[PDB]
Amino acid sequence: MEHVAFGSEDIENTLAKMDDGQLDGLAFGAIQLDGDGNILQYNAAEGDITGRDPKQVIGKNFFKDVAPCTDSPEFYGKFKEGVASGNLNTMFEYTFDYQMTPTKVKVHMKKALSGDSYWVFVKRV
Numbered sequence: 001m002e003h004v005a006f007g008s009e010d011i012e013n014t015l016a017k018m019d020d021g022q023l024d025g026l027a028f029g030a031i032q033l034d035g036d037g038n039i040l041q042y043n044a045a046e047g048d049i050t051g052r053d054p055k056q057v058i059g060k061n062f063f064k065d066v067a068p069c070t071d072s073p074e075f076y077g078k079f080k081e082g083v084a085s086g087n088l089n090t091m092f093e094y095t096f097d098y099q100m101t102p103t104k105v106k107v108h109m110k111k112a113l114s115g116d117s118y119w120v121f122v123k124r125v
């Protein structure tokens with residue numbers, strides 16, 4: 001493992017050092033999105049939760065193609081408000097149910113420290 005707790009206050013600073021391999025050492029799912037919702041990074045824990053193969057989803061649009069069940073005010077609407085504002089820090093439960101067994105999770109979206117990119121962190125509940 002990497003030693004980082006889900007929901008940690010300074011998670012964006014800790015995950016700024018991780019390349020894709022390091023991200024694969026987290027205890028929770030982690031996705032890095034650009035401001036349009038294209039997938040930049042997608043770790044092994046997330047693939048275990050959702051069934052997606054990480055290298056096959058990087059470059060895809062999370063809200064349009066990968067995760068249409070999240071294209072809603074309750075998930076994508078929060079994301080795009082945060083992108084537009086340039087600030088995002090929200091944690092909520094959600095169900096992932098697209099071409100998969102419905103899976104209840106806790107989601108934490110947080111703007112990355114540098115640049116303009118956005119983390120989506122996920123764990124089972």
Ligand SMILES: *C(=O)/C=C/c1ccc(O)cc1
Binds near residue numbers: 067
């Ligand atoms: C709903 O369509 C959710 C889909 C989904 C969520 C999270 C992922 O990493 C992959 C697909």
